[PDB]
Copies of this chain bind each other. A is one copy, B any other.
């Protein structure tokens, strides 16, 4: 497939120069005020979306459990036990069917949002990740999917929902924020707001949006996304603490996922959250979690390849039956595990099913209760669960989560991977309690460290994940035990496989730029990765040549150049070549006054022109006759160019009958005179640093004599291409 990258690099021409000349300091102040207002509105809307999801998820799950529990009781009295299972299966099948249909409406809504958000912040523009229909389909699918008990999450897709809101909202409201730079900034702000609403950590969201889109440090935009995040996480709170509780002005609880309070349960001699002796246990748990994450990634990748090979090339009826099958299998498994193998233990959140008086079923309590309740019980309750219960729950949940993720329904991954780790940590703590005394430390710390290790194994994130976990825990003293677990579980896992998101984005074939290049990559030069073949546009060019090159070629940008070695066309080109050059003596005076050879020809680089501007010029009557001088021109303004910005007409779409051939079109005013260039003798690391951090596109390579020698595109800087070229370079010598 082929994808269109974002045009993040700024383009400055005469219309923009006129707008800048008209611009004044008061206008700049008004612009900044409007930008602040838009940021605040984005935060508020993301908070409202989170509230809308959470309220209906809770309502549906509570109603479903209310219908079944009584039926469980009556059908257990006589011993039928069937109607309880039949009603549960009916509810699950209905919800999963609705979610599958909704995903069938919009294909990109499937799976977690993060794989399709790391690409937009990197500038790949997956074809359907901004459209409002995607937002509606995903937000409706998430509530239906989790209500069906598919072992999924809600905190995942909230990032994509916030990203869509941030991308869309400013467009609805000197055109305002038409350039792709502003769109990318607002997408970053929306992603940060979504992360804050999901996890309750504002600084974690700011740091997540800082990376995954790594550009030059923009002090003044980070200060805006932090405000957006703070507003987003304190609007969800203001309503979720006013609906659940009675007080309205109170801010009693952070966003969707909260771990609780980490303190010694009772005033006890020598009770601490953690001590220096536990560090070995933390390291061992980290490496175990890394191995488990590697196994999870391996099985998930194999399953994804199998589905991509067989299931996808099937009619629309298939890919809908698979979700129903997995929902049925998981419902049957959870019901059987609640009925049998669940140890009844002597005693509102706790559910007692199939169990005698004054006793509760731990398996049922873990499986039925919503994931937040299960997490809270695993962290802050001691002695409630037997080790066999924990082992069975961990194995079943791990296998079912590994099998489930990837199917059509809008799954999540943070919670179902945050739940197995807690169970493993609690099991480890229970084992350690028997052999040695554990009174000197808290019990829930092991569960927290296990959860952190499993996340580190599965997703393999850094910096952002550490901050998110620390600010969710609400205890800064957990800074060290968590981090030394994230940096170990990662290092253990990188031996076997990459992260889930990297695996699922490499399957799509999307080209992604890595963070840094190896030293062997630096050994290469820039002359080895450029593309010697070029498509060029002369200034004052023929309209027939323009339409021919636009129809024949697929490149999105053309270097406007002049030959180095119609009569009016040639005369105008020579006049421009003499007018454009500026010598140092001239500048000082101004200050004081106050075959293959034909194919590969020397050309002097003058600028870059985008395909969109050429199409816009062709659509309008932008041309002059050969007899007439180039002075006469429509001279379109900025607003006229931006009028067609959201949707750019295709060249084949245009009728093109009106256009008169043998007509000269001037592209000098509308081109980008000064793009970032680089000498062919430069090394790969500098080129990669520029092309990544500056976020630009189509980096031209020009030699010492001003001859343009090549163009570098993102396809030339992927890891596979660099590795292949390095292997070829070793093969040459």
Enumerate chain A interface residues (CB-CB to B < 8 A): 10, 12, 20-21, 23, 25, 28, 200-203, 210-211, 214-217, 219-220, 222-223, 226-227, 230-231, 233-234, 238, 247, 249-251, 254, 270, 272, 274-277, 462-463, 466-467, 470-471, 474-477, 479-480, 483, 487, 515-516, 518-520, 522-523, 527, 532, 580-585, 587-588, 591, 594, 596-597, 600-602, 604-606, 673-674, 676-683, 685-686, 689-690, 693-694, 703-710, 732
**Chain B residues within 8 Å of A522, by CB:** 20
Cβ A20 vs Cβ B523 within 8 A: yes
A251 B477 Cβ-Cβ under 8 A: yes
- On chain B, the residues within 8 Å of A584 by CB distance are 532, 600, 602, 707-710
Nearest CB of B to A327, in Å: 37
Question: B674 touching A677 by the CB < 8 A rule?
Answer: no
Cβ-defined contact, A466 with B226, below 8 A:
yes
25 pairs from A and B in contact (CB 8 Å cutoff):
A20-B519, A21-B523, A203-B203, A203-B470, A210-B217, A211-B219, A216-B693, A220-B516, A226-B483, A227-B487, A230-B479, A231-B480, A251-B272, A254-B476, A582-B680, A582-B681, A583-B602, A583-B703, A583-B709, A587-B709, A604-B704, A605-B704, A673-B682, A693-B693, A706-B706
A28 to B523, CA, bound (A): 13
Which of B214, B518, B519, B580 sits near A704, CB closer than 8 Å? Answer: B580
Distance A475 CA – B523 CA, assembled complex (angstroms): 49
Q: Which residues of B contact A220 (CB under 8 A)?
A: 515-516
Residues of B within 8 A of A523 (CB): 20-21
User: Which of B215, B233, B275 touches A250 (beta carbons < 8 Å)?
Assistant: B275
Give Cα A222–Cα B467 distance, bound, in whole angstroms. Answer: 13
Residues in B neighbouring A686, C-beta threshold 8 A:
10, 674, 676
A192 CB to closest chain B CB (Å) equals 13
CB distance from A636 to the nearest CB of B (A): 21
Chain B residue with Cβ nearest A534: B584
Query: With the chains together, A594 CA to B731 CA distance in Å?
Result: 10
Number of copies of this protein chain within its complex: 2
Can you name the residue of chain B whose Cβ is closest to the Cβ of A272? B250
Query: Which B residue sits closest to A680, measured CB to CB?
Result: B582
Contacts of A583 in B (CB 8 A): 602, 703, 707, 709
| CB closest chain-B residue, reference A732 | B594
How far does the alpha carbon of A522 sit from the alpha carbon of B10 in the complex, in Å?
Answer: 12
Bound CA–CA A596/B588 (angstroms): 10
Measured in the bound complex, the distance between the Cα atoms of B523 and A23 in whole Å is 10
Q: Which of B249, B518, B606, B709 contacts A276 (CB 8 A)?
A: B249
A268 to B480, CA, bound (A): 35
The answer to whether B230 touches A581, judged by C-beta atoms less than 8 angstroms apart, is no
Contact indicator A467/B203 (Cβ below 8 Å): yes
A593 CB, min distance to chain B CBs, angstroms: 10
Known: A23-B519, A216-B689. A591 touches B709 (CB 8 A): no
By Cβ-Cβ distance, the 3 closest A-B pairs, closest first, are A674-B682, A214-B217, A216-B693
Interchain CB contact under 8 A, A217 and B693: yes
Contact A222 B463 (CB under 8 A): yes
Bound Cα distance from A197 to B683, whole angstroms: 40
Q: Kindly identify which residue among B527, B685, B705 contacts A581, using a CB–CB cutoff of 8 Å.
A: B705
- In the assembled complex, the CB of A337 is this many whole angstroms from the nearest CB of chain B, namely 37
Q: Is the CB of B234 within 8 A of A480?
A: yes
Minimum Cβ distance to chain B for residue A316 (Å) = 41
Q: Which residues of B contact A532 (CB under 8 A)?
A: 584, 587-588, 591
- Inter-chain contact A585/B606, CB cutoff 8 Å: no
Select from chain B the residue with minimum beta-carbon distance to A523. B20
Question: Chain B residues near A674 (CB, 8 Å)?
Answer: 678-679, 681-683, 686
User: How many Å from the CB of A710 to the closest CB on chain B?
Assistant: 7
Residues of B within 8 A of A28 (CB): 518-519
Which chain B residues lie closer than 8 Å to A25 at the CB level? 518, 520
**How far does the Cβ of A318 sit from chain B's closest Cβ, in whole Å?**
41
Question: Is there an interface contact between A249 and B277, defined as CB atoms closer than 8 Å?
Answer: yes
A238 nearest in chain B by CB position:
B276
Q: Which residues of B contact A680 (CB under 8 A)?
A: 582, 587
**Separation in Å of the A61 CB from the closest CB of chain B?**
27
Residue of B nearest to A515 (CB): B219
Tell me if B677 and A673 are in contact (CB < 8 A): no
